[PDB]
Amino acid sequence: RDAFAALAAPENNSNPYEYMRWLREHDPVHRSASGIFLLSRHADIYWALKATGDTFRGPSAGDLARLFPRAAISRSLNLLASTLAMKEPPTHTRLRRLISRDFTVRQIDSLRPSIVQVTQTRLGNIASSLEKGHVVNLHEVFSVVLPMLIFAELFGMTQADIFELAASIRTILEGLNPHASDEQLAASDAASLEVERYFEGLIEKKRREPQSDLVSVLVSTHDDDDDKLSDTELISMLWGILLGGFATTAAMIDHAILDMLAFPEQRRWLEGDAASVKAFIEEVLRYDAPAMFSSIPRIAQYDITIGDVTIPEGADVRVLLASGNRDPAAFPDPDRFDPSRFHGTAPGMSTYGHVLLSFGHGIHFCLGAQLARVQLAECLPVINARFPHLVLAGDPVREPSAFLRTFRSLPVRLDTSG
């Protein structure tokens, strides 16, 4: 009845793609009970993403207050509101320019050895148990761990520090849920205080003793421009990067593993050259999303129409990226897992010239898209090579959420013969 509630029901946390098809055909410009709109077709989603900046503005202070009424003047909402995802041009333009100057393709490629090293170490840790015929929850022992250890490497942080930060993130997000208790609010403000204090200390540390990591580069001088992120901007940028990769990459890894196990005839892509591996990962992304529906508010600047449906000035429009990715006008035979769609093409572009929507499009296109892609391209062949007879051990347990599609468990074992 209400698309956001329908998509969060258990069966739709499980397989929402039949309902998404229904929306695309029967209610493509869905108005929820709240008044927020939801676009499900590839064409309309692509349009809305590329119109962000002109036709759609970012959320104002009034918009965030309405979306987070319980936390309207809290430190935690102030921190969220300062992140790149919640900014609009021209402030967004400068902030994105400055982080992209230092968070580069070369910087990300320099993490590839570390991704292999972490994967090798975590897989070694469970090899004995798997060899004895036991079941391992790969989500808990691997998928959620690798992205955090890679953030530690990128930022120049300790493992202990990144795991405490992740715990703070969980607390903060709990405090921004609409049902949040006053106690969760207080815990969120305390965790937000700690996050700021931590990053302040990290910035000061790398400023005195720079290293090769991203924070050291961000806080040091730059030859071409003397523009740079201020300390308050730096805290917000590092925080927003962590939030962006908090649970998304882990869900991606989980989905890739599940696709490897469901379609063992496609494992060959992971055994091939760089172009072959990349194609598998592109199709993993096309096949599932970690949120489904978008988190960034897009506020209509004026009365818009999509078809004969009016979206009034001031309304909030969200997009169902996972539905666009299974739209047959963009991806023929959309329910088939087929990496050849993306073989030899530009990242996120099919052989027919239709774009993958898993990272968005336009000015808010995922800052971490290359980092996510490279993490998957390096770890998945290693997993496939270490445990050639890995199989699914039981049904994955999905993590109940109103906003995200993540797993609590991904149980795996080796195919054993007595």
Ligand code: HEM
């Ligand atoms: C597979 C993993 C990921 C997926 C599927 C994903 C998805 C997305 C999507 C769809 C958006 C745009 C949302 C919109 O336009 O409404 C976005 C934005 C963003 N992502 Fe990711 N993301 C992933 C991983 C990461 C990582 C590893 C980082 C680390 C830098 C990151 C940082 C960000 C940031 C900072 C933004 C805001 C960009 C802006 O507003 O200019 N994400 N992400």
